[PDB]
Structures are given as C-alpha cells and as structure tokens.
C-alpha cells in the first residue's frame, strides 16, 4: 500500500534520528556499554527521559538500534560499522550531511529548474566555488575536508581490490592529486610503481604524502595539465580515479584517447568512480547523493552509467571492455579496457 | 550489511525527491499522461534534460515512479494515492513538510537536550505558540491550516470505521472543536446523535460546520471546559479524538474518570489517536513524526503506547478494555472500554 511512502515522506526525520544518535553519542555509548536500559541511556547522555524515549523509538524503528527485554543494543548496520573500523568515517560523513548538505537540499527544486546550484544561497560570497563560500563560515572549511576524506575512505577499498593491480607494472594516475590513492595502491601492491600525473599545485601536496610514506622510490610525480599536455610513455596501465565525472562526454573521449596513445600496447585503462545502473533505476545511494551535487557545487558532477563509460572506452579504441561491479553498499566500481598489441 | 544505512544517511534527500516531484508536477503529469519518456517529461516540466534525468533517477530508485522501456509511470504508492482520491491530501502534507517542518528538524538534537522546541528559532516572535510565530511569515498561516486539515483527512477514516458507532446512540465528543469529526460521524451513521463538548470559542466554528451540513438536528454543542466543568449526562458513548496526547498521565485519568461518571452504565469510551507500539519498536510513521512534535510546537504532544492507554481506562474503572488496530499505513487506532451496569 502507501506504507512505502513513510520513509520518504518523513525521510528528513529519518536522517535526524541518525544525526542525533551521533551528536549525542548514543551509538558509541551502546557500543562500549553493551545493553543499556532506556533509563541508563537517558542518564549517560544527560537527556530528559522523554527525550531519550523519543530518540530511542526513532533509532529503533529505523533499525539503527534494537531493543530486547528493556535493553538497547546497536542494530546490525551500526554494529557492523564499528566492527569494520568504519565508525569514525560514518560519524564524520553524518556530520557532513548535518552541517553542509541538509539545509541547502531544500533548494533542490530550484536547482533542477535553473540547472545551477541554488543551495549556495545559504553561503553568501562573491567567489565561484564551494570551499571559498564554505570557508567564510567558521568551522566549515575544516569539516568540509574532513568529510571529503571520510567519503573517500569509504570507497577506496573497492579501488585497491581491483584485480588488475596484480598484473600491471607501471600505473599512470591521471589527476592523482594528493597521491593518497597512489600511496595506498603502492602499499597494497609492493612491486607496483605509480606516477601521479597532475597540476604542479597539487603535486606539492603529493610529494608530502609520498614522503611521509617513504615511497619516494616507487611513487613519482609528473607535472602536467591532463588536457593540453601529453602523457608520459612507458606506462602499463592508466587510471582515472574520480576523473570522468566532471567532464563532458566529448571531453572524456579526449582524455581516454590520451590514455590510449600513452599506455603500452596490451595495457589497461581503469575508470574508477561511482556508477548509475544502466537501467537508471538505481542504485539508491547514487540517486539520493545527487541532491548534494545538484544543490551545492558550482561545477556539475555527473554519475554516468556503466554502459556510457564502456562506450567511451570502445570509441577510444580499447578492447576487452567490461565492468567490475563488486559488493557492497556504495555504488563505486571499475570500468576497464585494454589497448591491443 | 550497511545497505540499510542508505535511506537514512540520505533520508533528507529521499524526502527531497518526493518534494520535487510534487512542486514540479511530475506525479500529476505521469498520472494524466500515462507513460512518458524522460525527454517528454523534461519537456512538459520545462526542465533541463540533466535535471529531469536526475529527478527521475531519484524518484525511480525510491519506487515513487517506475521505468519500463524508456517510459515512466507513477509507482505503486503514488498510483494508489491517486486511485483512492488522496493526492491533494498527500500533496498538501508534502508541502507542509517542505515549508514548515524541514528546516526546523535540524534542531532536533538541541530540542531533545533542552526538552523544549529548539526549532522555533526559525520563526522569531515574542508569543508562545506555533501559529502566531508562523503567522509572522506571509503564506505560512494559510499553509499551516491546510496541512493540518490534510493530516486529519488522512486519519479520519479509521475513526469512522470503528464498529462501536453502529451500536451506540448518543455520543459525547470531548474537545470536539470544529465538529468536523462529529459531522462526518453523523453522516456515516444517520441514527446517531452527537454532542460537541468544547470551549465557547471553538463552538462558534462548530455551529457553522454543523449548519453548512444542515445537521443542527442531530449534532448539538455544549459549552464547557473539559477539566473544570462537568459533563452532560444521558450520553451512551464518550469520545476523545486526539485529546489524550497533550496531557499528563494524571490529567488523562481526570478526563477519563469524568467520562466514566458522565457516560451511562453499559456505555463506551473510545480513545482515538496515534499509538506507539507496546514494545516501542515502532511504528515508523509515529517514530519519525516525533521530530516535528519535538522541534516546533511549544506544547509537548505525546504518543502513548496502546498499553498505556488501556491501563488508564482500567484505572478509571472501565471494563472490557482492549484495542482496535486496523490497517493500514497510519499509526491511528482506537482504545476502548465500557462502564458496567
């Protein structure tokens, strides 16, 4: 019936239950101190009993907590987040939704209409990019980067698990930025060598990320503009991590053809980012995440379908083009291809 | 796994998909014009194609719309809302969540802490009730009442379906206000007679609601304060519709004992409102609806469990105490009892 409307019609409230449990330390409480009674919870969090009962009904109905014989535990998802070392990441991301995303999401309608970021009315400035606007509010700059680091840390396992890194030798990371993915990649695969190709400005951060990891031997940098300049030869594999999502389809063909001439015959290209399902029915994560991308940043980020991306690789001349859609909950994956010999 | 986090972590966005489809007329469009292609939708709504694709992915992932061979229909829930004549009610309620509830919900945390309505910071005033604060913003007064009328219209069927109204003769509606429930009740049950017991102020609205329906014969009014004054005798059944939810448990016992002395032996008391499940695990509607009740109004509304209410009826001397929990999606029901002979 209409029951499916409930988590949507009250969706903003559903979020607030998670937001609250995070800010008031409920989930951490239930993690450290096992089963606790409503009254024990109410005490530990210094909340009016009425308030605690309400919060606990919220969190329990959502499956964020369970209640057995008067005692409250974390539910399956929150339980798992702790077990897998994800809690600080999940807490930080929820804090991001609270302080950055929540209020501007109310400008989705106007953003869809005007095709611009209508939500930026909540962050007055004269400049034309999100962080500068955010930096005008004390606290938000720091949170913005903490959030971005958290989001990345949610996805980066699926990149490292990609089987191609146990067969390629020299990887060219296009727009590799702060080398964090490059370092991680190099640690997980010791014989592998990685070149971070990016703008001079970003590479100063990259040489420090590389240095701290003491990987100055296997992880090099190469100053270039990924569009105008040409790519260094002798690379076995070309990687675009979160690159193809801000460019026009034709601009993506330019980059991929650049990957094709640069990579060695037999070589691989790997496109790693978030993908929409080909039938455009999901996945829900991507679908709901677009509200942020539609409402806040000035630059339009697009999540292309797997099939879209597969098509570009073929237009650029790659063969053995296919996809790697591994579980689980995030919509991140890899589209891949080879240059022939 | 963590998949259950998605509709919660992005819950505010999930709401925005419904909000958008309502404001831009998508669901009405898909209702009137059958299956439409993304491009046809994009055209009719005057949206950038990018915008329409995003909205449609949102709505389709949520099950609000379905897509078959390039053509979009309304999904099961939205389909049903139209079929059952509920669309204007659902549209109005969604408009309520958009303009009144959404932004203050971000003050849930502070509301739980302070036990007061922290969300009212968004509606500056010197007075101490919600509507006055809302009336200071042009448009909101009118929307507030339109919303309230819509919410009521969602629940009032479950009251009328209550079997007791085919066996009682004279009903005393305690705090019956604008007689809308009294009129409806009288129309659906022609032999029934109804007395609206309320404050003189409310009864002036009630005599007009009664008059328009030309039911001045079967629907009377009786000026009283439900706490200090006494109740008129000769009534077969005493009704509290949405009454027990703003009072302290002891204040509810006072009202119910008043119901007991006033009702005739053999008579019924009917408590009709929204109920929390006894195990406090739901229902989700009630659980998420509390964010509004915690953040905006100055008066604390409580949704008591069925068992709580059943207990009060017993403390007031009623027998044959039980509950009527009929489907479907709203948490509204009836707790009932009899005075013995």
Residue numbers in the entry:
A (entry chain A), B (entry chain A): 4 to 344
Paper passage:
The Streptosporangium sibiricum SibL (Ss-SibL) protein belongs to the S-adenosylmethionine-dependent methyltransferase (SAM-dependent MTase) family. It transfers a methyl group from S-adenosyl-l-methionine (SAM) to 3-hydroxykynurenine (3-HK) to produce S-adenosyl-l-homocysteine (SAH) and 3-hydroxy 4-methyl-kynurenine (3-H4MK). 3-H4MK is the key intermediate needed to synthesize pyrrolo- benzodiazepine (PBD) antitumor antibiotics, including sibiromycin and anthramycin, in Streptomycetes123. Two monomers are tightly intertwined head-to-head, with ~23% total solvent accessible area buried in the dimer interface.
The apo form structure was then solved by molecular replacement. Each ligand-bound subunit of Ss-SibL showed a similar and robust architecture in its peptide backbone, whereas a 2.1 Å r.m.s.d. in the 294 Cα positions was seen in the unbound structure, indicating a considerable conformational rearrangement upon ligand binding. Superposition of apo form and binary complex structures indicates a rotation of the C-terminal domain of approximately 22° toward the N-terminal domain36. When comparing the bound and unbound forms of Ss-SibL we observe that the peptide backbone from strand β6 to helix η5 is shifted by ~4.6 Å to constrict the active site upon substrate binding. In the apo form structure, the nearby acidic residue Asp132 associates directly with Tyr134. Therefore Asp132 can assist the deprotonation. Upon cofactor binding, the shifted Tyr134 is probably ionized and ready for catalysis. The three structures also reveal an open-to-closed conformational change induced by the cofactor, which is required for formation of the substrate-binding site.
